[PDB]
């Protein structure tokens, strides 16, 4: 009955914890739906390159955010406290329902 949203700046770091959640959930007997990759959100920042002049020369940076989604439909309290007391590496954002 719980929905978990995981979002981070790097997919490699993200997916390790994303899976760690699903194993730590289903090991204690939980019916869980696998991660669903939601669309990433990328934003662009264009800044002039020079200090004074030269508008014709620029440089563009980007920041892209990745997202996941986990569902559990028939939890048990053991799954609840296992997920809650489990700690993820800093760099991800977890929003437990």
């Amino acid at each position: 009955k719980i929905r978990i949203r995981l979002k981070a700046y790097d997919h490699r770091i993200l997916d390790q914890s994303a899976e760690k959640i699903v194993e730590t959930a289903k090991r204690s007997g939980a019916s869980v739906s696998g991660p669903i990759p939601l669309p990433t959100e990328k934003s662009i920042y264009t800044v002039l390159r020079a200090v004074h002049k030269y508008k014709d020369s620029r440089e563009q940076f980007e920041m892209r955010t990745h997202k996941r989604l986990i569902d559990i439909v028939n939890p048990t309290p053991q799954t609840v406290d296992s997920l809650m007391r489990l700690d993820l590496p800093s760099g991800v954002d977890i929003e437990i329902k």
């Binding site: 979002k7 981070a8 700046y9 800093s90 760099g91 991800v92 954002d93």
Partner: protein
């Protein structure tokens, strides 16, 4: 032409950025207090030869890892200086702080340390022609794959500014499987300002 910063190109491919936290709606506050912490740490441990600092945020807490080549002079007599830093940072940041030290082996494979050593040497009225190659010799006998240094400015006290560079080994700057470390430092002399730029190509 103009070369792109050799760390800017390799962030997100093979290198990694320092500040490792995700945040929104309060991004600016975290970023600016991180810059404040960085400056506060940098201007105090000048003699301690600090290379890299990492800030790791987690739920109203800060976890800072400091990399040094002389860890003993960073830790206090039993951890007194570390405790003083922790309490001062607690006062400044207004949230729980925690600090860790990671020692560095082969302090000749960190471009920042070599740059700042050459900077102090040039401040001590030493000939750049000797300091550059001295640093090159230490770094290559350390086991490095390539090294290149340059020094620019009012060279040797002259009236006209110029630049001089020495390189040896191999430094492929257009390869993205590089693992190249870059650093730039300022030597403030009685004749003005000089800039030292050192960058190193490591193995594997």
């Amino acid at each position: 032409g103009q070369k792109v910063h050799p760390i800017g190109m390799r962030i997100g491919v093979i290198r990694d950025w320092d500040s490792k936290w995700y945040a929104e709606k309060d991004y600016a506050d975290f970023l600016h207090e991180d810059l404040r912490i960085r400056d506060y740490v940098a201007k105090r441990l000048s003699d301690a030869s600090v290379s890299r600092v990492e800030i790791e945020r987690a739920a109203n807490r800060v976890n800072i890892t400091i990399h040094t080549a002389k860890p003993g002079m960073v830790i206090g007599k039993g951890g007194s200086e570390v405790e003083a830093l922790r309490k001062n940072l607690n006062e400044l940041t207004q949230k729980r702080v925690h600090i860790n030290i990671v020692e560095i082996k082969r302090a000749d494979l960190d471009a920042k340390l070599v740059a700042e050593n050459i900077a102090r040497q040039l401040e001590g009225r030493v000939s750049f022609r000797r300091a550059q190659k001295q640093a090159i010799q230490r770094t290559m006998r350390a086991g490095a794959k390539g090294i290149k240094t340059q020094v620019s400015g009012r060279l040797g006290g002259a009236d006209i500014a110029r630049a001089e560079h020495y390189s040896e080994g191999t430094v492929p700057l257009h390869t993205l499987r590089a693992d190249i470390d870059y650093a730039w430092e300022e030597a403030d002399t009685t004749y003005g300002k000089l800039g030292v730029k050192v960058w190193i190509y490591r193995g594997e």
